[PDB]
Design a protein around this ligand. Structure first.
Ligand code: BCB
Ligand code: BCB
Ligand code: BCB
Ligand SMILES: C/C=C1/c2cc3[nH]c4c(c3C)C(=O)[C@H](C(=O)OC)c4c3nc(cc4[nH]c(cc(n2)[C@@H]1C)c(C(C)=O)c4C)[C@@H](C)[C@@H]3CCC(=O)OC/C=C(\C)CCC[C@H](C)CCC[C@H](C)CCCC(C)C
Ligand SMILES: CC(C)=CCC/C(C)=C/CC/C(C)=C\CC/C(C)=C/CC/C(C)=C/CC/C(C)=C/CC/C(C)=C/CC/C(C)=C/CC/C(C)=C/CC1=C(C)C(=O)c2ccccc2C1=O
Ligand code: HEC
Ligand code: HEC
Ligand code: HEC
Ligand code: HEC
Ligand SMILES: CC(C)=CCC/C(C)=C/C=C/C(C)=C/C=C/C(C)=C/C=C\C=C(C)\C=C\C=C(/C)CC/C=C(/C)CCCC(C)C
Ligand SMILES: COC1=C(OC)C(=O)C(CC=C(C)C)=C(C)C1=O
Ligand SMILES: COC1=C(OC)C(=O)C(CC=C(C)C)=C(C)C1=O
Ligand SMILES: CCCCCCCCCCCC[N+](C)(C)[O-]
Ligand SMILES: CCCCCCCCCCCC[N+](C)(C)[O-]
Ligand SMILES: CCCCCCCCCCCC[N+](C)(C)[O-]
Ligand SMILES: CCCCCCCCCCCC[N+](C)(C)[O-]
Ligand SMILES: [Fe+2]
Lengths: 273, 250, 323, 332
């Protein structure tokens, strides 16, 4: 039921809303007011997805697709089987994600720790809003948003990119991809370094903070340090979406041509043309 | 004929799809989720499932002598000054006394070893600059020695007298201060200090609460369990420095 | 707020530390110097660096690959320096455009590309020996070298193993900023849409999962920096309240948790599986699957949609249509 | 650096697929104003008198027209092709039957080509059709033509820089890139796919698994073919002022039915039309043109999609003079 060190931490308090009313656990899970609102939005959103899918052509989990309205509906409500289920599921998704984030703040407060995790989780919630709310608002129709389907959301990403001929030349995408790659590489370096110090092999002794810093000073001439690699990892991962969002919002509202042609700002300077 | 086609209208990539999921779930469930249980298990409330979920014990050979084996049984028989708020199994507990001094909730410390953390060459790692005389403050940064520590109520709680530096990582981790009116020295983690040019602001506890900050056994060294006791006391004030702090923020 | 998690308010300075390795102590070169502004968000000390045979070989082999590519790029602008600087992102060294199969192509249609790939591979292998041997020299496990090996193996898959399996050097990745990007689309088009390759999906799930885990783990350690959670080696050998609280934050949020050691195994495994999943998908592509979309249609997975504008019969198949 | 909102967007596929046009209102307005320069149809004339096959001495294509109908055609041709130069661009002013000026015999072949487009390629031009203006836009040299190597500027009415000039070897990669929507694709899709019918644009397998006998070694098309088809598609997209989803659901570029729009089939007919125009009407004109008109391999200038479309999905936004000049086709 409890970890061997857990009981002393299970004290009352730390909520943002509700106080003692929902301040309790169900098995390992903390509830709180935002645990109750998270379960409400998750139950509604999954129920709406299940009923929308029951009216479509397939029960295959890869092929099911619940889609937004035609562009002609603009920012208005659409009939349920013509975009309205998608609209209601999107509101439940945002409610569930924000409830999840604020519940993490209550859990952090009860434990006396920093709120850095819920703050970091605001980044993917923000990117979901860029894709489903802010860009569609700027273009004037909910129908520019992505559909809910395991493979169909990929068909939307695919066509969206090719609407700008070659999306790889989008400068916001180049930044986003570069952060995705250096973050995945850095996480392998960090996980591998900590494991290599704690697990030298062959009954050898566990090594030290000094050995950690010596390894990368030897391999690349610099060690960022044990606290700082965690600040760097949060920074690299967060900037996947914090820079990518600029590339997503620019496409349509601030640029309608192919992305390769955008680089004419450099290529077409009269001096070297 | 087609490359990859097999009997029964199977093909090779289709088989590798099921194989990849088998590899992923075997590594995630049988290896990683068991590595996740090297601390805190068995749970408290001998079932077969309590044995199946654990990995075989591993032993760390420590750099300065001795070994540590995990998982191992670690009952916490330390008396907790906490009472149930309700009969429900998931009901929260409430402090029966001063939760900062009793060290419960966010004021809890872990039963770490009463051992001084060591440098790679075996010297005390975390030490005051009056001992670490080859260490210094970088040019450009505030020297906090002599500055007042101002607590969450805006009252001066004491005067900073030294900084404790991590000699292995070249990084300050505590300030040491004389506590006003209490005839004692106290450490505070630098993460609880807002370092300004004319004062150190500490919003985690009130001025009066500096009198009961955990005391070190020795003057110029600190053990791993003492570092936990000192850090946990200020963290406890985030929830307990006033009765208002435990209640709904909004 | 914990301002230490944003930047170092008061920086410390002390004598530089050197940990002796089993060999190579005399191949460290440089006098370390200190950046005060770097010291706000990282260690202020820069240098010294280890030289050694493996790293010198990597630089010799890699500089040769880089000069072969740059000379061929310079030939593409007829050695005009201003146009080289202007057009640089568009310039490339390409694999064979003609189909020679596995035949060694002429220098002017793929041969210089093959030589640049050979010297890059030797450079990657020599750097791997450095990454592996520096760990052994300092008494550390070789976990970083095995993650690095999966990344090198993926590069070998798209550079020469897939070309060898289908029997054509024309399929290799070009050297150049835009040209290596153009290959991504040529390859996805040729093999029927890489969104429909399950191993592209696995690699992306692990790559996004590395974003999730490093955001989550980096923020978790900053959230417990007041308890010394960044001193992860001694939190592993002697659990402190930093990692008790980190574990309970996740247990109370998602219903389960890791240890401070095992979260680094999760991160190491997710990073490794980006490259392992990507390599498996490239090894299957062209060898055993020609069109990933039609393979997903064959196995019943691909979504289908109603027409919006009228359905459009292939005009090439109409009665009387020209070729 | 950027284009201010709002953007005009259309839908060309099922909702939720991000398929449709994305257009900048100021660019659409500027193109409509340029295309609106298309001269109005000349006043109709009643057919009266004998056919000009009886009245004039050297009429081989328009002989069934009466004199007033035929002189109306010559006035329209002058408006469309040589309005600044006038009738004497093609004619000896003292003998209108003389073929001594080279533009006369080229114009007669162009009258045959234009009537062939409107009679034999209605699968592409429909009942909108083409006139001399569709390509020429009021100058003897059409503004958008192609040689057997890439040339800049795309619009030959703009003065080239030294590096744009085809003789300057250092500018080659930019001449290639500005023909494929600024991509780095190292292929000229005009000479590969539109000058003749030697190559297949399709490169994607039509089966899930690789067929044994076409999937190993020299049996295979080289991956260069897929880059080259991508270059053609970037060029077609930029030539029509549109993007891939005007014609394809990118889920499967290779599929037709619900995965392609009706415009993709019209585009397919356009590739066959352009190959016919170039192989059978335009390329053979190098024997009739002056050396100053020819590219560096002796080639005559030839047509691509941009020659008529000039950045718009229908040339001149669908403007037509087909009913006004039935002598340009379709011919019964
Ligand atoms: C042909 C079209 C292409 C395309 C089209 C494309 C578009 C149109 C966009 C990207 C974007 C992005 N692309 Mg690109 N792309 C990328 C990489 C990237 C990503 C780094 C980046 C951001 C993805 C994102 O927004 O996630 C979003 C993820 C979110 C919002 C997750 C939210 C999580 C949520 C808060 C919580 C969910 C909880 C679950 C429901 C709960 C489940 C319950 C269970 C678990 C208990 C690579 C590495 C490549 C390569 C190697 O070729 C590539 C090629 C391509 N992209 C093609 C060129 N891509 C985006 C970008 O930033 O562009 C600049 C973008 O808009
Ligand atoms: C701008 C570009 C985007 C993009 C591009 C993209 C690509 C190109 C690919 C995915 C893939 C994936 N995407 Mg998608 N995506 C997904 C979910 C997913 C999964 C189906 C799959 C694995 C992702 C993963 O492991 O992440 C890391 C997170 C981990 C490891 C934690 C576990 C997450 C869990 C697997 C998610 C499960 C979601 C549920 C299936 C759906 C919700 C269930 C509800 C009803 C309870 C969500 C929930 C969202 C939201 C909420 O916005 C999102 C948005 C976007 N994706 C953007 C539109 N994504 C890959 C795939 O295989 O698709 C079939 C793939 O190739
Ligand atoms: C239109 C075409 C597309 C495409 C084409 C594509 C291809 C062709 C491939 C991927 C692959 C992959 N794609 Mg996909 N893709 C991805 C994401 C991913 C990556 C997770 C993954 C692995 C590649 C990688 O990590 O390289 C980064 C890491 C690398 C390259 C390892 C380098 C390590 C090396 C040791 C570094 C050495 C550097 C040297 C020092 C440099 C010096 C050299 C000198 C000497 C010359 C996303 C998130 C999206 C979205 C959101 O749309 C997307 C869409 C698209 N991809 C489109 C469908 N993608 C790969 C895959 O998984 O295939 C199954 C792959 O082959
Ligand atoms: C740049 C920084 C990033 C980042 C960071 C962090 N990420 C976090 C955290 C942090 C810090 C947490 O703290 C939090 C967590 O607890 O971790 C264990 C979390 C979480 N990251 C999830 C998924 C995830 N992270 C992704 C990406 C990034 N993460 C990037 C890289 C991606 C993709 C695809 O990229 C995915 C899919 C969940 C596992 C979890 C949310 C649980 C939830 O919200 O519960 C509440 C909601 C539910 C349990 C289900 C709600 C169902 C709705 C109502 C109905 C479905 C609607 C839906 C729109 C349909 C989509 C269909 C689909 C096919 C298209
Ligand atoms: C019809 C329907 C759907 C409606 C019903 C809805 C329903 C489920 C409600 C049931 C009601 C319940 C049970 C009670 C209510 C209470 C409540 C709010 C329950 C929540 C239930 C709920 C929605 C559960 C979902 C939980 C969830 C989102 C899990 C996702 C897990 C995933 C995929 C995580 C991805 C990241 C991942 C790979 C992590 C693995 C590694 C881990 C554990 C890292 C965490 C971690 C890190 C990062 C450290 O740095 C660290 C450092 C030092 C020590 C420990 C750790 C540590 O544990
Ligand atoms: C080239 C673009 C031309 C311009 C400009 C003008 N004309 Fe023309 N003309 C041209 C051709 C190709 C032909 C032969 C048509 C055929 O069916 O073979 C002609 C013919 C004439 C004639 C008949 C001469 C004769 O055989 O007796 C006349 C009288 C004539 N054209 C008149 C004319 C006028 C008045 C023009 C300016 C308005 C003019 N032409 C321009 C090609 C071209
Ligand atoms: C696009 C399919 C065209 C149509 C419709 C018409 N013309 Fe054309 N013309 C076209 C090209 C590609 C070229 C070669 C480039 C060149 O300028 O030589 C031409 C050429 C001519 C010329 C000669 C111009 C010159 O070299 O001085 C003439 C006189 C001409 N074309 C006349 C003409 C007429 C009368 C047309 C309507 C019947 C007509 N052209 C249509 C492309 C296209
Ligand atoms: C209509 C004007 C189109 C635009 C816009 C795009 N494409 Fe296209 N595509 C079109 C046709 C008529 C054809 C068939 C050509 C033939 O002679 O058969 C194609 C073909 C492709 C292919 C190959 C499909 C196959 O079966 O192998 C690909 C991969 C392709 N097109 C991609 C593509 C891209 C990336 C586009 C935007 C840059 C694009 N097309 C636009 C018609 C049209
Ligand atoms: C002049 C001889 C043309 C050339 C060369 C090309 N096209 Fe064309 N196109 C032309 C006409 C007169 C029309 C009809 C316009 C109308 O009002 O209906 C078209 C039409 C198309 C379309 C359809 C656009 C739509 O219906 O919205 C497409 C997709 C198209 N053309 C494509 C296309 C391509 C790819 C070409 C180069 C291979 C091309 N056209 C050349 C005239 C001419
Ligand atoms: C029979 C056998 C034994 C012989 C086969 C030979 C062999 C092993 C061949 C292997 C070939 C391989 C692995 C080829 C792989 C090629 C790949 C993956 C190329 C990918 C990307 C390349 C890029 C982006 C190159 C960019 C190059 C430049 C901008 C010019 C070089 C200049 C630099 C400063 C290099 C820095 C690299 C980058 C950070 C910009
Ligand atoms: C254990 O902490 C770590 C460091 O500090 C000791 C590093 O320098 C590095 C190396 C990082 C850089 C930017 C040199 C990593 C990966 C790390 O995990
Ligand atoms: C000569 O090399 C180049 C640069 O370096 C000065 C650039 O900044 C740029 C512009 C790119 C950025 C990110 C400013 C290009 C295109 C380039 O080719
Ligand atoms: C009380 C916890 C410490 C006791 C030592 C750990 C128990 C041994 C677990 C053996 C089971 C291992 N495994 C993988 C076979 O399940
Ligand atoms: C894959 C390319 C291999 C080329 C060899 C490069 C030089 C290797 C140097 C080996 C050094 C051995 N050492 C010092 C680690 O023991
Ligand atoms: C990233 C692409 C993912 C596509 C996965 C396709 C899996 C095909 C094989 C299993 C399909 C099972 N089925 C029929 C229930 O869909
Ligand atoms: C596509 C990438 C797949 C990554 C695997 C998913 C990792 C999350 C597994 C959590 C399982 C939790 N639990 C308690 C059931 O074991
Ligand atoms: Fe860590």
């Amino acid at each position: 039921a409890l970890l061997s060190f857990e009981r002393k931490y299970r004290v009352r308090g730390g909520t943002l809303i509700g106080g003692d009313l929902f301040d309790f656990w169900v098995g390992p899970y903390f509830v709180g007011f935002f645990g109750v609102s998270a379960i409400f939005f998750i139950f509604l959103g999954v129920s709406l997805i299940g009923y929308a899918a029951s009216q479509g052509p397939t029960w295959d989990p890869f092929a099911i697709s619940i889609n937004p309205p035609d562009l002609k509906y603009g920012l208005g409500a659409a009939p349920l089987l013509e975009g309205g289920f998608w609209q209601a599921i999107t509101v439940c998704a945002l409610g569930a994600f924000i409830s999840w984030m604020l519940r993490e703040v209550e859990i952090s407060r009860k434990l006396g720790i920093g709120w850095h995790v819920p703050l970091a989780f605001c980044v993917p919630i923000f990117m979901f809003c860029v894709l489903q709310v802010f860009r569609p608002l700027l273009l004037g129709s909910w129908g520019h948003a992505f559909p809910y389907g395991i493979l169909s959301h990929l068909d939307w990403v695919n066509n969206f990119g090719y609407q700008y001929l070659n999306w790889h030349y989008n400068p916001g995408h180049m930044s986003s991809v570069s952060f995705l790659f250096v973050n995945a590489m850095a996480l392998g370096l960090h996980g591998g370094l900590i494991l290599s110090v704690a697990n030298p092999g062959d009954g050898d002794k566990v090594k030290t903070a000094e050995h950690e810093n010596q390894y990368f000073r030897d391999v690349v001439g610099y060690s960022i340090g044990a606290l700082s690699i965690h600040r760097l990892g949060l920074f690299l991962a967060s900037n996947i979406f914090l820079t990518g969002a600029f590339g997503t919002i620019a496409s349509g509202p601030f640029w309608t041509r192919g992305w390769p042609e955008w680089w004419g700002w450099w290529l077409d300077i009269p001096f070297w043309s | 004929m087609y490359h990859g086609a097999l009997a029964q209208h199977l093909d090779i990539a289709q088989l590798v799809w099921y194989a990849q999921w088998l590899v992923i779930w075997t590594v995630v469930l049988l290896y990683l989720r068991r590595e996740d249980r090297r601390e805190g298990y068995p749970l408290v409330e001998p079932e077969d499932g309590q044995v199946y979920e654990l990995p075989y014990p591993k032993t760390f050979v420590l750099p300065h002598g001795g070994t540590v084996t995990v998982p191992r049984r670690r009952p916490e028989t330390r008396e907790l000054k906490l009472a149930q708020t309700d009969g429900f199994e998931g009901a929260p507990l409430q402090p029966t006394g001063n939760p900062l001094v009793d060290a419960v909730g966010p004021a809890s410390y872990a039963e770490r070893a009463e051992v001084v953390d060591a440098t790679v060459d075996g010297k005390a790692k975390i030490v005051p600059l009056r001992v670490a005389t080859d260490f210094s403050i970088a040019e450009g940064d505030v020297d906090p020695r002599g500055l007042p520590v101002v607590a969450a109520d805006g009252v001066e709680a004491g005067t900073v007298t030294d900084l404790w530096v991590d000699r292995s990582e070249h990084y300050f981790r505590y300030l040491e201060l004389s506590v006003a009116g209490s005839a004692r020295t106290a450490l505070i983690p630098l993460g609880f200090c807002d370092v300004k040019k004319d004062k150190i602001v500490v919003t985690s506890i009130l001025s009066e609460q500096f009198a009961n900050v955990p005391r070190l056994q020795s003057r110029d060294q600190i053990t791993l369990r003492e570092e936990d006791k000192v850090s946990a006391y200020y963290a406890g004030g985030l929830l307990y420095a006033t009765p208002e702090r435990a209640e709904s923020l909004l | 707020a914990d301002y230490q998690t944003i930047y170092t308010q008061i920086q410390a300075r002390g004598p530089h530390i050197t940990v002796s390795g089993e060999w190579g102590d005399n191949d460290r070169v440089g006098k370390p110097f200190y950046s005060y502004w770097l010291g706000k968000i990282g260690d202020a000390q820069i240098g010294p660096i280890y030289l050694g045979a493996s790293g010198i070989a990597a630089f010799a082999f890699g500089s040769t690959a880089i000069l072969i590519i740059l000379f061929n790029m310079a030939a593409e602008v007829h050695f005009d320096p201003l146009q080289f600087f202007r057009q640089f992102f568009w310039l490339g060294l390409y694999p064979p455009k003609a189909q020679y199969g596995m035949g060694i192509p002429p220098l002017h249609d793929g041969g210089w590309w093959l030589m640049a790939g050979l010297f890059m591979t030797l450079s990657l292998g020599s750097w791997w020996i450095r990454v592996y041997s520096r760990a052994r020299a300092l008494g550390l496990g070789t976990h970083i070298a095995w993650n690095f090996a999966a990344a090198i193996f993926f590069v070998l898959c798209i550079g020469c193993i897939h070309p060898t399996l289908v029997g054509s050097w024309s399929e290799g990745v070009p050297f150049g900023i835009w040209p290596h990007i153009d290959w991504l689309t040529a390859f996805s088009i040729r093999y029927g849409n890489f969104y429909y390759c399950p191993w592209h999906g696995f690699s992306i799930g692990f790559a996004y999962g590395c974003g999730l885990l490093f955001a989550a783990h980096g923020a978790t350690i900053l959230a417990v920096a007041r308890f010394g959670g960044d001193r992860e080696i001694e939190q592993i050998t002697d659990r402190g309240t930093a990692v008790e609280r980190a574990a309970l934050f996740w247990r109370w949020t998602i219903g389960f948790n890791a240890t401070i050691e095992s979260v680094h195994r999760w991160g190491w495994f997710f990073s490794l599986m980006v490259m392992v999943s990507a390599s498996v998908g490239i090894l299957l592509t062209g060898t055993f699957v020609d069109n990933w979309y039609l393979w997903c249609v064959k196995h019943g997975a691909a979504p289908d949609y109603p027409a919006y504008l009228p359905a459009t019969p292939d005009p090439a198949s109409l009665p009387g249509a020209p070729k | 650096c950027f284009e201010p909102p709002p953007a005009t967007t259309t839908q060309t596929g099922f909702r939720g697929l991000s398929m449709g046009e994305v257009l900048h209102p100021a660019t659409v307005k500027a193109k409509k104003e340029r295309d609106a320069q298309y001269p109005p149809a000349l006043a109709a004339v009643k057919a009266e008198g004998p056919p000009v096959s009886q009245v004039y001495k050297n009429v081989k294509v328009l002989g069934n027209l009466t004199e007033a109908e035929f002189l109306r055609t010559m006035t329209a041709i002058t408006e469309w092709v040589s309005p600044q130069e006038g009738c004497t661009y093609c004619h000896d002013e003292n003998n209108l039957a003389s073929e001594a000026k080279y533009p006369y015999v080229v114009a007669r072949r162009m009258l045959e080509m234009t009537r062939a487009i409107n009679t034999n390629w209605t699968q592409h031009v429909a009942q909108t059709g083409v006139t001399c203006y569709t390509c020429h836009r009021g100058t003897p040299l059409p503004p958008y033509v192609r040689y057997l190597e890439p040339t800049l500027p795309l619009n030959n009415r703009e003065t080239p820089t030294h590096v744009e000039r085809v003789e300057t070897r250092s500018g080659y990669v930019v001449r290639l890139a500005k023909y494929t929507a600024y991509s780095a694709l190292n292929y000229d899709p005009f000479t590969m796919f539109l000058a003749n019918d030697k190559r297949q644009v399709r490169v994607v397998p039509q089966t899930a698994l690789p067929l044994v006998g076409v999937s190993r070694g020299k049996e295979r098309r080289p991956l260069s073919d897929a880059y080259a088809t991508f270059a053609l598609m970037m060029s077609i997209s930029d030539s029509l002022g549109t993007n891939c989803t005007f014609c394809h659901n990118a889920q499967t570029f290779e599929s037709w039915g619900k995965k392609s729009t009706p415009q993709r089939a019209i585009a397919w007919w356009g590739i066959r039309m352009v190959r016919d125009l170039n192989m059978n009407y335009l390329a053979p004109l190098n024997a009739s043109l002056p050396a100053s008109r020819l590219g560096r391999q002796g080639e005559a200038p030839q047509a691509d999609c941009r020659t008529c479309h000039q950045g718009v999905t229908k040339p001149l936004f669908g403007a037509s003079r087909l009913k006004d000049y039935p002598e340009l086709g379709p011919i019964k």
